[PDB]
Design a protein around this ligand. Structure first.
Ligand SMILES: *[C@@H]1O[C@H](CO)[C@@H](O[C@@H]2O[C@H](CO)[C@@H](O[C@@H]3O[C@H](CO)[C@@H](O)[C@H](O)[C@@H]3O)[C@H](O)[C@H]2NC(C)=O)[C@H](O)[C@H]1NC(C)=O
Ligand SMILES: *[C@@H]1O[C@H](CO)[C@@H](O[C@@H]2O[C@H](CO)[C@@H](O)[C@H](O)[C@H]2NC(C)=O)[C@H](O)[C@H]1NC(C)=O
Ligand SMILES: *[C@@H]1O[C@H](CO)[C@@H](O[C@@H]2O[C@H](CO)[C@@H](O)[C@H](O)[C@H]2NC(C)=O)[C@H](O)[C@H]1NC(C)=O
Ligand SMILES: *[C@@H]1O[C@H](CO)[C@@H](O[C@@H]2O[C@H](CO)[C@@H](O)[C@H](O)[C@H]2NC(C)=O)[C@H](O)[C@H]1NC(C)=O
Ligand SMILES: *[C@@H]1O[C@H](CO)[C@@H](O[C@@H]2O[C@H](CO)[C@@H](O)[C@H](O)[C@H]2NC(C)=O)[C@H](O)[C@H]1NC(C)=O
Ligand SMILES: *[C@@H]1O[C@H](CO)[C@@H](O)[C@H](O)[C@H]1NC(C)=O
Ligand SMILES: *[C@H]1O[C@H](CO)[C@H](O)[C@H](O)[C@H]1NC(C)=O
Ligand SMILES: [Ca+2]
Ligand SMILES: [Ca+2]
Ligand SMILES: [Ca+2]
Ligand SMILES: [Ca+2]
Ligand SMILES: [Ca+2]
Lengths: 5, 234, 387, 6
């Protein structure tokens, strides 16, 4: 997915 | 600035360092594994073969703790081989991010060269592998003049090795430093930072306060040594 | 040479300082760490009747040291050499490990041939194995041709396949359809889809054919029975019914020496049960540290029953009596909800309903983990077609 | 995933 916080 | 491990990392969210054994740990979110290696990155190994979307990582004692974004838990495993894998928390209401240990015992301590006259740097210094490394602030354009000890404005007027660079950009000749004469005007060439490591020409005379004067400035027309040591002991 | 102590003066480890040679175990710490007063000092030289060592001997600066040949190890007190029991470490020898005085002997079943190393053996046949898995809509068979995996469907009219097994005598593939409530059979070439059980099935979990006695065993979750029938499905009877709550797993050992059956039940008080086929000699073999047991398979050369767990998330094996229980994959996040199990040579294959993948790994230690294929739906059944 | 295949 997204490697965000 | 050099790369340590750079072959197959994708999404290295976590990084940890174990001072007890000097091994480096990191975690990958896409590869979903936690790897260890030496500080040089030679003895690379895999500690945990499946760690999901790990974000934070921290090693204390015999275990490595990491938070997982996918399954909102905190896990642990043995730092050497990844055994004893258990979940510290239930599924948290939100995704945990970041992790650290609170340790009361003082960690490894070493003598900071910056603790002595700011290490000779002008504004900001940090202890390097061999000695204190000077640095310049984030605002303004600067360059490491004067043996990388002085941060001076980067106007492009680079000046000769036969000269001493001031904080004002003026380059008096290098013999004028630390003679208790404010040749800089603002006293930059006379600050205690440089005089603690400077030294007096062999063809000059050394003052008690660290200043340097030619011999014809002793017991002479006027006092210019700063502690009356030129006029004393003729 | 660069600055160090290149002369005979005894240099302490890591330091730029060297000391006199008389310092060794003389009573006063001379090196910064006291290496002269070494923990291995005050041991008699090898002139003291070989220093008591049972093999070759050393009498270096640090007291004395006993050494042993290959296949041997030191005792705790370094008094004598001791043999390594190479068969006591699982997976060291693929089949039938035998321990010698300082070495090991190995052999494999008549279907296997030993390799250059005397530990590993491979199948003697010239035919590669086939891996058959049960996706919801289709049956997927993997041509295992030197890791050149090639997916293709086996049968087309499948709607919901759960169980899978094969008959080597006739070369057919058996499966049960959950939506149709039928058991089918086909040739490995996808031809001759004939029915065997057309009614009397509600939720058939796994199917295990008896290739020696020409029988067919299966477990039905809704009926809570273990049933047996002829290989063509003619004569059906209920085999096990007393305390059978939620039977899932099923494995068979039709070899006349064993003639034994195993099944798994995940009701209250879950357990793995062992009984002789015809259900006379019934006993429980595994009931400790078990919760949602799922899937069974038998290592025929070693007579080990491999079993899996969906709640505790492990893969284990044990003897036919339940003893020598061991873990191959435990405390590992790779397992989420494994369902079915399959063995071949030294590899173990299982289907995971959580990750929707069928995976592989060393059937002894659980390493060398890899992915076999990704399935759109949950892969339920799995079996390996090979003589 | 619930264990009941049905
Ligand atoms: C798919 O495989 C099946 C099973 O092999 C094939 O069906 C039949 O298989 C037999 C195997 O022996 C073939 O050989 C025949 O055996 C009889 C035994 O008495 C023998 O008398 C015959 O002379 C012959 O050797 C048999 O030919 C074959 N049946 C057919 C229709 O040819 C089936 O053919 C295979 N289908 C495909 C897609 O090739
Ligand atoms: C990954 O890291 C290695 C160093 O560990 C890099 O290898 C160096 O590459 C430079 C050129 O970029 C050479 O001048 C060095 O001699 C190389 N060092 C060695 C030991 O080979 C490698 O280029 C890096 N690769 C990437 C993709 O950054
Ligand atoms: C699938 O596996 C089968 C069985 O091993 C392979 O069939 C043989 O393959 C070899 C090598 O190509 C041929 O020389 C033989 O003639 C084949 N025999 C038969 C009965 O067909 C087949 O090639 C494999 N197919 C794929 C896609 O790998
Ligand atoms: C089926 O279940 C019952 C209940 O667990 C079994 O009865 C128990 O059997 C043990 C001996 O193995 C006794 O020690 C218990 O006292 C019994 N409990 C009760 C409540 O009766 C019974 O043996 C099982 N029967 C079969 C055919 O396996
Ligand atoms: C995965 O398979 C590889 C071989 O494909 C294994 O590699 C061996 O690892 C052991 C232990 O480090 C070494 O002693 C051998 O020299 C290795 N052999 C080869 C051919 O690489 C490896 O053991 C397997 N997985 C594990 C348990 O690490
Ligand atoms: C050897 O010593 C260790 C540590 O005391 C002990 O744990 C181990 O059981 C001993 N092994 C044998 C074979 O005596
Ligand atoms: C003083 O002497 C020290 C040691 O030799 C350094 O050379 C230093 O650079 C000297 N000072 C000057 C004039 O640069
Ligand atoms: Ca001056
Ligand atoms: Ca003067
Ligand atoms: Ca000593
Ligand atoms: Ca031995
Ligand atoms: Ca689970």
């Amino acid at each position: 997915x997204x490697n965000x916080x | 600035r050099v790369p340590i491990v750079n072959t197959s990392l994708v999404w290295p969210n976590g990084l940890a360092l174990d001072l007890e054994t000097d091994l480096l740990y990191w975690a990958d979110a896409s590869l979903q594994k936690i790897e260890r290696s030496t500080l040089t990155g030679t003895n690379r190994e895999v500690v945990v073969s499946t760690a999901f979307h790990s974000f934070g990582l921290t090693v204390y004692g015999q275990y490595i703790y990491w938070t997982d974004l996918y399954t909102r838990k905190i896990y642990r495993a043995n730092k050497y081989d990844g055994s004893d894998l258990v979940a510290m928390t239930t599924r948290l209401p939100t995704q945990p991010s970041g992790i650290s240990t609170v340790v009361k015992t003082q960690r490894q301590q070493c003598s900071n060269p910056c603790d002595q006259f700011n290490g000779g740097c002008s504004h900001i210094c940090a202890p390097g592998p061999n000695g204190a490394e000077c640095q310049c602030p984030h605002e303004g354009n600067w360059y490491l003049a004067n043996d990388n000890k002085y941060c001076v404005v980067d106007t492009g007027t680079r000046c000769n090795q036969l000269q001493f660079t001031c904080l004002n950009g003026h380059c008096i000749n290098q013999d004028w430093k630390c003679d208790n004469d404010n040749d800089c005007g603002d006293g930059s060439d006379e600050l205690p930072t440089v005089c603690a490591f400077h030294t007096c020409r062999s063809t000059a005379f050394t003052c008690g306060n660290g200043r340097c004067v030619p011999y014809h400035y002793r017991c002479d027309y006027y006092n210019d040594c700063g502690d009356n040591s030129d006029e004393a002991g003729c | 040479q660069p600055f160090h102590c290149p002369s005979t003066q005894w240099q302490c480890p890591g330091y730029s300082t060297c000391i006199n040679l008389s310092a060794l175990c003389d009573g006063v710490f001379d090196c910064p760490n006291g290496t002269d007063e070494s923990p291995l000092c005050n041991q008699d030289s090898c002139s003291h009747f070989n220093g008591g060592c049972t093999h070759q001997c050393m009498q270096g600066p640090f007291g004395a040291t006993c050494l042993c040949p290959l296949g041997y190890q030191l005792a705790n007190d370094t008094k004598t050499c001791e043999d390594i029991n190479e068969c006591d470490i699982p997976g060291f020898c693929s089949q039938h490990c035998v321990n010698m005085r300082g070495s090991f002997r190995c052999a494999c079943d008549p279907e296997y041939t030993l390799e250059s190393d005397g530990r590993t053996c491979k199948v003697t046949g010239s035919e590669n194995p086939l891996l058959v898995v049960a996706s919801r809509d289709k049956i997927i068979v993997d041509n295992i041709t030197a890791h050149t995996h090639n997916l293709y469907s086996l049968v087309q009219d499948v709607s919901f396949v759960v169980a899978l097994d094969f008959d080597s005598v006739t070369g057919r593939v058996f499966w049960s359809d959950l939506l149709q409530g039928k058991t089918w059979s086909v040739f490995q070439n996808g031809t001759d889809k004939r029915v065997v059980h057309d009614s009397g099935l509600s939720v058939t979990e796994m199917i295990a054919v008896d290739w020696i006695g020409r029988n067919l065993y299966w477990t039905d979750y809704a009926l809570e029975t273990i049933e047996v029938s002829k290989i063509d499905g003619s004569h059906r009877t209920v085999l096990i019914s007393k305390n059978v709550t939620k039977p899932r797993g099923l494995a068979l050992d039709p070899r006349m020496g064993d003639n034994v059956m195993f099944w798994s039940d995940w009701g209250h008080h879950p357990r793995i049960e062992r009984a002789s086929m015809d259900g006379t000699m019934r006993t429980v073999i595994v009931q400790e540290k078990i919760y949602w047991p799922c899937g069974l398979s038998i290592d025929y050369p070693n007579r080990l029953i491999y079993f899996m767990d969906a709640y505790l998330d492990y893969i284990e094996f044990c003897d036919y009596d339940g003893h020598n229980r061991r873990q191959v994959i435990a405390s590992d996040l790779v397992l989420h909800h494994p369902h079915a199990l399959t063995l071949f040579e030294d590899f173990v294959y299982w289907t995971d309903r959580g990750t929707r993948q069928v995976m592989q790994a060393n059937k002894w230690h659980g390493g060398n983990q890899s992915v076999v294929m990704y399935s759109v739906h949950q892969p339920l059944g799995i079996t390996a077609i090979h003589p | 995933x619930x264990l009941x295949x049905x």
